[PDB]
Design an enzyme around this catalytic site. Structure first.
Site, PDB file in Angstrom:
ATOM      1  N   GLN A 156       0.794  -1.224   0.000  1.00 51.27           N
ATOM      2  CA  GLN A 156       0.000   0.000   0.000  1.00 51.27           C
ATOM      3  C   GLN A 156       0.828   1.276   0.000  1.00 51.27           C
ATOM      4  OE1 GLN A 156      -2.372  -1.836   3.431  1.00 51.27           O
ATOM      5  NE2 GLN A 156      -4.026  -0.976   2.193  1.00 51.27           N
ATOM      6  N   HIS A 182     -15.097  14.308   3.325  1.00 54.54           N
ATOM      7  CA  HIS A 182     -14.138  14.156   4.405  1.00 54.54           C
ATOM      8  C   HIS A 182     -12.709  14.502   4.009  1.00 54.54           C
ATOM      9  CE1 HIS A 182     -14.250  10.222   2.269  1.00 54.54           C
ATOM     10  NE2 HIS A 182     -12.938  10.364   2.371  1.00 54.54           N
ATOM     11  N   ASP A 225     -17.079  11.121  -5.088  1.00 57.90           N
ATOM     12  CA  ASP A 225     -16.937  10.051  -4.108  1.00 57.90           C
ATOM     13  C   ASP A 225     -17.980  10.158  -2.989  1.00 57.90           C
ATOM     14  OD1 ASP A 225     -14.912   7.850  -2.956  1.00 57.90           O
ATOM     15  OD2 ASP A 225     -15.230   9.298  -1.332  1.00 57.90           O
ATOM     16  N   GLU A 265     -20.763   8.366  -6.902  1.00 59.34           N
ATOM     17  CA  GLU A 265     -20.655   7.046  -6.316  1.00 59.34           C
ATOM     18  C   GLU A 265     -21.678   6.929  -5.197  1.00 59.34           C
ATOM     19  OE1 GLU A 265     -18.170   6.324  -3.186  1.00 59.34           O
ATOM     20  OE2 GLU A 265     -18.027   4.146  -3.446  1.00 59.34           O
ATOM     21  N   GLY A 309     -26.730  -1.221  -3.846  1.00 58.74           N
ATOM     22  CA  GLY A 309     -27.274  -1.940  -4.987  1.00 58.74           C
ATOM     23  C   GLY A 309     -28.784  -1.835  -5.216  1.00 58.74           C
TER      24      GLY A 309
END
Ligand SMILES: *[C@@H]1O[C@H](CO)[C@@H](O)[C@H](O)[C@H]1NC(C)=O
Ligand SMILES: [Ca+2]
EC number: 3.2.1.1
Length: 476
Positions: free
Chosen positions: A35, A122, A206, A230, A234
């Site tokens: 990462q 955020h 986002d 986003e 579902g």
């Protein structure tokens, strides 16, 4: 660019850190488990646009550009861009402001769009939520601007979802109080400046469900461009209404049935077929949604099955469904990584083969879609129509009569049987000659109206009026 301008687009989505290094290396280490920043840059993208445009994409979506928390945290570096700290500075890892503008102009000089990922929900902070030192954030440099610390305990409580903090106490995500006028005005002013400074054609927004709805119309308006959100849920009844406050959302409703439909030989074509109709009807505008089966927040398609023919079908669907196709860098090389961070594989490690199976599949499908659009101004606004299904098959039709594309998709897999399918509903004139634009064969419409579709090896079939292909570089 406008929502209208965007309908005709197809998007290659990439992680800036993971797509292409400035040095163009195809060997530079990238262990996803570490990462870390792996080296990808905006200038690297510029150098690989031939590879991207060669698949027939008309736009890219890149991860957030704002300067990030600097620390190497216990969860690694902010290589993905979702942990911002100073919104008026760029992330130096990807290059300079001049580099970003260079990417923009280079895309434009090819007739392509730049889409940029932005977070409003955020900031990111290395450390516990209650202990956050707000002074690091710019411009939101005091607790003043944030919702009080708390975690989302109950996702059925939409107020918790919007008012509490995402993240945890290792990397916390201080949640802006997006109901405050000072926060709105700061974000609204910022987003317009971002778009103008860098000639950005569109935004991918986002964490949209984590911000109260009345924030979004003003944000979208300020941006002055197509915004696609986003909304990570579902259920069409939860997700589609967000299109009432924002131009589009990513098609998470289609995503789940789409994945299940093709991830095994026993997947439900019924659920997919129905969801297409539910979305078509109950969503403000299905043609402004974005279709995908693979991204950085779910296991990659090929992690579920290594069947190349299945991968071929689901990619064809993404390209030919209503709305804007979104392919995730690596999907065209059959990348098979599981959940974050395994699904953030560097693209350059594939060597960028432009002759791989799925690269060619995707090129063919974009080629027809792009052509159809250049001839048929009603294509993008024509709501995809599922005309047939069975236990292993789904067929669908899109485009003005006489110019329609009819797509037959299968989940039989690579060992599927050879045979013939008689297709009612295509709406082609009898005896008309059609081209199958993937494998480049021809078929003639029956007198019974039906189409004799040769099916073999679970391959996708994409039909289009042969007379209409005249003068195209398609199937020469
Ligand atoms: C846009 O440019 C102005 C002037 O250079 C600068 O002050 C501002 O920070 C920029 N906006 C963004 C979002 O970077
Ligand atoms: Ca929030």
């Amino acid at each position: 660019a406008t929502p209208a301008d965007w309908r005709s687009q197809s998007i290659y989505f990439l992680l800036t850190d993971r797509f292409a290094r400035t040095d163009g290396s195809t060997t530079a280490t990238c262990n996803t488990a570490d990462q870390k920043y792996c080296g990808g840059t905006w200038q690297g993208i510029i150098d690989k646009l031939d590879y991207i445009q060669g698949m027939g994409f008309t736009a890219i979506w890149i991860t957030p550009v704002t300067a990030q928390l600097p620390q190497t945290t216990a969860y690694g570096d902010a290589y993905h861009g979702y942990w911002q700290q100073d919104i008026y500075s760029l992330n130096e890892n990807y290059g300079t402001a001049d580099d970003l503008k260079a990417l923009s102009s280079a895309l434009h000089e090819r007739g392509m769009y730049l889409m940029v990922d932005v977070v409003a929900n955020h900031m990111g902070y290395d450390g516990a939520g209650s202990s956050v030192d707000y002074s690091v954030f710019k411009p939101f440099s005091s607790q003043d601007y944030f919702h009080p610390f708390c975690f989302i305990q109950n996702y059925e409580d939409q107020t918790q979802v919007e008012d509490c903090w995402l993240g945890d106490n290792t990397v916390s995500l201080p949640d802006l109080d997006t109901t405050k006028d000072v926060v709105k005005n700061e974000w609204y002013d910022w987003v317009g400046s971002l778009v103008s400074n860098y000639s950005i054609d569109g935004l991918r927004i986002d964490t949209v469900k984590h911000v109260q709805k009345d924030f979004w119309p003003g944000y979208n308006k300020a941006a002055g461009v197509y915004c696609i959100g986003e909304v990570l849920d579902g259920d069409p009844a939860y997700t589609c209404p967000y299109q009432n406050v924002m131009d589009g959302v990513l098609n998470y409703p289609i995503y789940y049935p789409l994945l299940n439909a093709f991830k095994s030989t026993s997947g439900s074509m019924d659920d997919l077929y129905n969801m297409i109709n539910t979305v078509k009807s109950d969503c403000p505008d299905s043609t402004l949604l974005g279709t995908f089966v693979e991204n950085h927040d779910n296991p990659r398609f090929a992690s579920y099955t290594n069947d190349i023919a299945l991968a071929k079908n689901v990619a064809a669907f993404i390209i030919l469904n209503d709305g804007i196709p979104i392919i995730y860098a690596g999907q065209e090389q059959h990348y098979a990584g599981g959940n974050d961070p395994a699904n953030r594989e560097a693209t350059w490690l594939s060597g960028y083969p432009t002759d791989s199976e799925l690269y060619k599949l995707i090129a063919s499908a974009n080629a027809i879609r792009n052509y159809a659009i250049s001839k048929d101004t009603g294509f993008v606004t024509y709501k995809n129509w599922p005309i047939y299904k069975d236990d292993t098959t789904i067929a669908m039709r899109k485009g003005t009569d006489g110019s329609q594309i009819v797509t037959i998709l299968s989940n039989k897999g690579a060992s599927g049987d050879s045979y013939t399918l008689s297709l009612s509903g295509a709406g082609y004139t009898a005896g008309q000659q059609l081209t199958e634009v993937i494998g480049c064969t021809t078929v003639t419409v029956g007198s019974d109206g039906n189409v004799p579709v040769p099916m073999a090896g679970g391959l996708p079939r994409v039909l289009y009026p042969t007379e209409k292909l005249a003068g195209s570089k398609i199937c020469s």
